[PDB]
Amino acid sequence: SMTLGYWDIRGLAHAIRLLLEYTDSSYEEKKYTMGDAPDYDRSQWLNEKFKLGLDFPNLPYLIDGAHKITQSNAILCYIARKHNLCGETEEEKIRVDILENQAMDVSNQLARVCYSPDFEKLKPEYLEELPTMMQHFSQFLGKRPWFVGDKITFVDFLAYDVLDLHRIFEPNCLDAFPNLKDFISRFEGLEKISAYMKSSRFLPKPLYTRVAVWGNK
Amino acid sequence: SMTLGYWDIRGLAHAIRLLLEYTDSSYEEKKYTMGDAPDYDRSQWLNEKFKLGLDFPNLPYLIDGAHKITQSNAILCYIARKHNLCGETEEEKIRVDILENQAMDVSNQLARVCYSPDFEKLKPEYLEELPTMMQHFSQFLGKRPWFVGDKITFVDFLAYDVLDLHRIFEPNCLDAFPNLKDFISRFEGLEKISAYMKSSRFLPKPLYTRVAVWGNK
Question: Which residues form the signal peptide (chains A, B)?
Answer without folding.
Answer: none
